[PDB]
RNA sequence: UUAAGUUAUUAAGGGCGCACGGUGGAUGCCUUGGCACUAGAAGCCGAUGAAGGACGUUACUAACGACGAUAUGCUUUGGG
RNA sequence: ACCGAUAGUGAACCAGUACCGUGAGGGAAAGGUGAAAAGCACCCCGGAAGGGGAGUGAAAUAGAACCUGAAACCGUGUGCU
RNA sequence: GACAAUGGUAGGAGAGCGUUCUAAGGGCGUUGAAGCAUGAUCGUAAGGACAUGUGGAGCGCUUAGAAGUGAGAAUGCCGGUGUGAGUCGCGAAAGACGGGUGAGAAUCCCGUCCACCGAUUGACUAAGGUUUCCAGAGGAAGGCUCGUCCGCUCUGGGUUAGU
RNA sequence: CGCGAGCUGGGUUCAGAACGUCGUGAGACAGUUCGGUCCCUAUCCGUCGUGGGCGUAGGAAAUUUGAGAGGAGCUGUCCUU
RNA sequence: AUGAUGAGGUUAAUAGGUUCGAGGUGGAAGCAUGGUGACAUGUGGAGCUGACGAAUACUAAUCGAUCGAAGACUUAAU
């Protein structure tokens, strides 16, 4: 079985979420947990978010134990952007992108 | 410095509807504004 | 300073090796086992750091 | 010896106030770098409390601050009294390594390490 | 066992193909709106204050529309 | 034997608006849930956003710039290398 | 059947594919149209069908007619997304600690210590701007970081003259 | 007439001015004179340094020959014969 | 620069502190004494002393975690 948990709309860019990600990628689920809580990277604490919220909505809905559970698929997608516009000399503008992601986690028992 | 330096009174009396009505060319220049839309005259 | 050309996705990934981070210097802590910790650092839920709450 | 981000006397006064604010606190949340530096000045200072001499007053009182500390029997105290008073009378035996560090984690905005660095 | 020879495995990461996704808003379908015109009517308003606007009126009121201290409307005649 | 939302009016939408300019003046972008609002009671994670189940619905893979939803682009998994 | 010709720019000639609409005729479609995607399909070419997934309502086919009738380039126009790149930069400057607040704290509040200005970074005040004032709530966007905070957002109040 | 994304900018070679001379004149002179803004965060190759991956048919630690490569390569004065 | 290289990681002298020194500065603070005073003298080559030498576990290098072989085939001599 499987069960997810997504994030929409998060303010974090994808090279900056994905980072953390590829430590996450198939791991046991405390490990992965700890993972998140010990890196000093911004990310971290909204991944944990939806990490948690996918072993909850596990542990009720789709009835799984906790304990057997390790990360199958974490993936992060673009969403849309907030283009801003920050001022460079010369009555020049210089474009900025306030980047999205759509972080989700997908959690597995192996079977 | 540069070069808008804003006063009220400098700024009626010289692009305000009465100075606009004071002549004759200062007429269509508001009826060119009534004749397209601009919700605001001067 | 300014580049000829555009870099491909594959020079891109290329270069993209290197900057991904490690895992940290990861532990558990014996007061409690599991609630893995930082190596020569205090853990948050322990307090403790070689048994002594702090 | 080290450099924190700071100029000559910026450094002093921020070592300084660290020493007299762990003279104070018997604690305090601060960085790595600045624990590990201001340690040196706070051993120092120990043994200045210890040797007891007027002399040694008047060389401690060239590195504490001025500061009033009300006490339990809510009474006004200063640092370098706390010091010469309480703190050298606690170690008179131990010859030396009067502060320990303790490595926290990193902290939210800036990453630094933070330590918890303590008199004991 | 030793000597000589031959050869693979690896994939940090990359390429090709496939599958699944996201962003993005093309395409298809549609139309509240517009374009060109036909027939008929009409071809001005205003000092008994114009056209155009400002300010205000609702139970709650920011704005569009209608309205004007008789103010989100008053009377009458007919329709319904 | 006219357009069908980069078209057709500058304007299908509160457009001669927003914005720019002292000023005359210039001058945009922006359409679609569903038959009907029946517009997600309720439980779980979360501080919230957001999400997962449940239930309305034919359809939520229709959940509010909500018909379809291409390409560039960003990624995950893997067969051959 | 025999024989021959068939490189090609500017360019001349000819036969055609396709697109949108219309007339006529014959037809398909919620048992699923157009459109999109996938395929190892047919034709001498432009290009045409068939299936399957999506999709949810219009569309082909024959003959003929009319055109806003085919785009890879115009330092083309409009929009979208990228590379540069996790790279410059984050805007003259002294902050540190303790206690709180809170899901969350270098960044908010209080206290202390230190420092900066001090013909002033102070006090008033004409223009100008026009509610940014104040109080209580909030953290989407703004803030070149964070944010429990704010000149931002919500609600409600606030400007009293015979001189 | 090596080298200005490595410098300078005296000189020539913009606009100002003045002398001689030419020209009716505007103005002109390889005639002279005073003065006069030198933009760029390096993508690729290249170069100098510095590391990770794998490979070198077991996995490791140390010492190592040298296919090759690079460097250095100067010269006076004095004394004696 | 960062990685790296090297010294060490409690069976421990890696750094800090502590006690001794070297080198440097050059005669602390307090007290007394002579002077109206500025000052001078003695106690005393005084006291201070970041990086250098030595000794010393007083503090921190904790408990831990990860990676890392079982050695292909063929031919010849044994
Ligand atoms: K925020
Ligand atoms: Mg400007
Ligand atoms: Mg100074
Ligand atoms: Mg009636
Ligand atoms: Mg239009
Ligand atoms: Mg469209
Ligand atoms: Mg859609
Ligand atoms: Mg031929
Ligand atoms: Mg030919
Ligand atoms: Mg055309
Ligand atoms: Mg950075
Ligand atoms: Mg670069
Ligand atoms: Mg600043
Ligand atoms: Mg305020
Ligand atoms: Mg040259
Ligand atoms: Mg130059
Ligand atoms: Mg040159
Ligand atoms: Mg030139
Ligand atoms: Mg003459
Ligand atoms: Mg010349
Ligand atoms: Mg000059
Ligand atoms: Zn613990």
Known sequence: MEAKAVARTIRIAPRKVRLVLDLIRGKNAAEAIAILKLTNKASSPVIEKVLMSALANAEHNY????DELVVKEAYANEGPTLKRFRPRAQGR?????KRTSHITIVVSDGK | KRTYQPN????SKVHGFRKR???????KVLARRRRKGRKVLS | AVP?????????????????????????????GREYKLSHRVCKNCGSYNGEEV | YRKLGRTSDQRKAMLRDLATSLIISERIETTEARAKEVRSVVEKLITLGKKGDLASRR????????VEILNEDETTQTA?????????????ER???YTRILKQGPRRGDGAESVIIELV
């Open chain 3, 4 to 32: 000829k050309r555009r870099t491909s996705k594959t020079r891109k990934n290329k270069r993209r090796t290197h900057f991904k981070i490690s895992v940290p210097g990861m532990t558990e802590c014996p007061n409690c």
């Open chain 2, 21 to 27: 009505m004071s002549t004759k060319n200062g007429r």
């Open chain 2, 8 to 11: 009220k009174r400098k700024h």
């Open chain 4, 80 to 92: 370098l009294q706390k010091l010469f008073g309480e703190i050298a009378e606690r170690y008179t």
């Open chain 1, 63 to 66: 009835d799984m134990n906790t």
């Open chain 1, 93 to 97: 503008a210089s474009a900025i992108n």
């Open chain 4, 59 to 66: 060389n401690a009182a060239k590195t504490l601050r001025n």
């Open chain 4, 95 to 97: 010859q030396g390594g």
